[PDB]
Amino acid sequence: YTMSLGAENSVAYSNNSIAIPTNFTISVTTEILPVSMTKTSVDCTMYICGDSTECSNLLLQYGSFCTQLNRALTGIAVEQDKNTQEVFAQVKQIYKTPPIKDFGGFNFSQILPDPSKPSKRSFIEDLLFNKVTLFNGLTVLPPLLTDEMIAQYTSALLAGTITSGWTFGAGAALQIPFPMQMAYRFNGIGVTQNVLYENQKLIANQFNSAIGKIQDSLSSTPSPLGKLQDVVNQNAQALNTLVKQLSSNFGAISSVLNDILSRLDPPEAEVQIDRLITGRLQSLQTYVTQQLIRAAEIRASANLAATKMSECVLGQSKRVDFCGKGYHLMSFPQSAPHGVVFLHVTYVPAQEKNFTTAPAICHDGKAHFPREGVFVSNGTHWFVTQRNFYEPQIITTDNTFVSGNCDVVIGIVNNTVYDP
């Protein structure tokens, strides 16, 4: 069939009408980003020849391709180490959460490290690590940073986040009450602190429920870490195809050098060896070039991950959809086998209600405009409220400003402005 783009609805647009949400949902979204790939170095001489002096003798006359490929792979490995260090090593101090976990009812025991000592990893890190499942001149160099240190870096970042907010990313960590941090973040997205201080229990419950839902999705739903799995699969496929290409004759009598030497006279035997050299060297160069392209793509992904961590973990981002669907509140990093996982805490309006609206209020022959808010209309009376939450207030000179008479504004209504 022809695919359907989605639900087909028309917004109830009207000249005098507005829709304002009266309640909210705290959503937590998971984002997976590859950071680094396995560091592989291939001995060009051994792969092409396989410890045969005569093959080496003709190979050396054939160029300096071995040096080029070796330096390319070494640069790729160093770049992988740089990517990992850049993404995670953002803080200069390893912060710690206090033993007393009183965060206003917000629960973080699923993302904080646990005393059980499973490599100092939380469920989400443990779930991700469990979820992802993984000799003729090629070798794999271990990463500079072990999983334990990456987990420690993540724990330091998360502890600094909850205990200090965004201050530790812009200087020295400054302790803050968690409720105050959440209120500051609400102020950032344009909602007054009163909403949090009056709905703190609901917000904490919603956040805990969202974290539990993320844990359930990771535990049960599969195919959530496709990007890391795809990267690992591509690397494995490249290595396997390279090893298989080693077992191809490339148009000679045999694919193994020992047999060719043991059965053939030196001139045509060396000719066959040379054709094998050409085929194997070309295949190795193809592998190196594809590895370089993959390294560039992974570096782009790692730069994106570092930007996300700096702009969403160390601070609050006003960029739309950069760190989750909805008004971004906070973000939490988590380690992954070759990547990072971001839990984006966002604010989503819900339970909207229609309200009539006027650009300004004409009182005493002068026009009044809201300072920061909207003149919604109840059937009984006109009210001024904030855009992102329905908190009606009596129109007053305190929250309105005058900008002349009321004969120039299109759509102005007549109402009284209370003077206190």
Partner 1 sequence: TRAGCLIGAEHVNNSYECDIPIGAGICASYSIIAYTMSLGAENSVAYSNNSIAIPTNFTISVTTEILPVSMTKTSVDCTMYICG
Partner 2 sequence: LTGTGVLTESNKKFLPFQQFGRDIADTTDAVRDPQTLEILDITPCSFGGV
Ligand X SMILES: *[C@@H]1O[C@H](CO)[C@@H](O)[C@H](O)[C@H]1NC(C)=O
Which part of the chain contacts its own copies (CB under 8 A), choosing from 39-47, 115-123, 131-139, 357-365?
357-365
The footprint of its own copies on residues 56-75 (CB under 8 A) is 58, 61-65, 67-68, 71-72
> Are the beta carbons of 4 and 369 closer than 8 angstroms?
no
The footprint of partner 1 on residues 334-363 (CB under 8 A) is 336, 338-358
Residue 19 beta carbon to its own copies: minimum distance, rounded to whole angstroms:
24
Phi-psi region of 54 (alpha: psi -120 to 50; beta: other; left: phi over 0): alpha
For residue 243, what are the contacts with CB-CB under 8 A and spacing of at least 6?
136, 138
The footprint of ligand X on residues 91-110 (CB under 6 A) is 101, 107, 109
- The total number of residues shown for the chain amounts to 420
Nearer to ligand X, 16 or 237 (CB): 16
Nearer to ligand X, 175 or 354 (CB): 354
The token duo for 16 is: 């005098």
Residue 114: is it exposed, middle or buried by C-beta count within 10 angstroms (0-12/13-18/19+)? middle
CA distance 323 to 319: 8
DSSP letter, residue 415: -
Rule CB under 8 A: is residue 248 a binding residue for partner 2? no
Report the DSSP beta bridge partners of residue 152: none
Residue 219 beta carbon to its own copies: minimum distance, rounded to whole angstroms:
33
Q: Which of 34, 113, 137, 324 binds partner 1 (CB under 8 A)?
A: 324
> Are the beta carbons of 368 and 360 closer than 8 angstroms?
yes
Rule CB under 8 A: is residue 135 a binding residue for partner 2? yes
Long-range contacts of 13-18 (CB under 8 A, 24+ apart): 15/411, 16/356, 16/357, 16/358, 16/377, 16/411, 17/354, 17/355, 17/356, 17/357, 18/354, 18/355, 18/356, 18/357, 18/374, 18/376
Residue 15 beta carbon to partner 1: minimum distance, rounded to whole angstroms:
48
> Are the beta carbons of 47 and 137 closer than 8 angstroms?
yes
The footprint of ligand X on residues 65-84 (CB under 6 A) is none
Compute how many residues bind ligand X; rule: CB under 6 A.
Answer: 29
The footprint of ligand X on residues 391-410 (CB under 6 A) is 410
Residue 412 beta carbon to partner 1: minimum distance, rounded to whole angstroms:
11
Rule CB under 8 A: is residue 266 a binding residue for partner 1? no
Q: Which of 38, 56, 286, 377 binds its own copies (CB under 8 A)?
A: 286
Rule CB under 8 A: is residue 94 a binding residue for its own copies? no
Q: Which of 4, 116, 247, 380 binds partner 2 (CB under 8 A)?
A: 247
The three-class DSSP label of residue 326 is coil
Rule CB under 8 A: is residue 385 a binding residue for partner 1? yes
CA distance 345 to 327: 9
CA distance 259 to 403: 96
Partner interacting with residue 12 (select from ligand X, partner 2, its own copies, none; CB below 5-8 Å by kind): ligand X
For residue 381, what are the contacts with CB-CB under 8 A and spacing of at least 6?
415
CA distance 410 to 11: 23
Q: Which of 381, 397, 416, 418 binds ligand X (CB under 6 A)?
A: 381
CA distance 329 to 316: 7
Nearer to partner 2, 10 or 247 (CB): 247
The three-class DSSP label of residue 417 is coil
Rule CB under 8 A: is residue 163 a binding residue for its own copies? no
Residue 2: is it exposed, middle or buried by C-beta count within 10 angstroms (0-12/13-18/19+)? exposed
Residue 359 beta carbon to ligand X: minimum distance, rounded to whole angstroms:
6
The footprint of partner 1 on residues 102-141 (CB under 8 A) is 102, 141
The footprint of its own copies on residues 180-209 (CB under 8 A) is 180, 183-184, 187, 192-194, 197-198, 200
Partner interacting with residue 41 (select from ligand X, partner 1, partner 2, none; CB below 5-8 Å by kind): partner 2
Partner interacting with residue 317 (select from partner 2, ligand X, its own copies, none; CB below 5-8 Å by kind): its own copies
Compute how many residues bind partner 1; rule: CB under 8 A.
Answer: 91
Q: Which residues of this protein are in contact with partner 2, per CB under 8 A?
A: 41, 43, 46, 51, 135-136, 139, 240, 243-244, 247, 258
Q: Which residues of this protein are in contact with ligand X, per CB under 6 A?
A: 12, 15-16, 19, 23, 25, 101, 107, 109, 177, 202, 206, 350-354, 357-358, 362, 378-381, 410-414
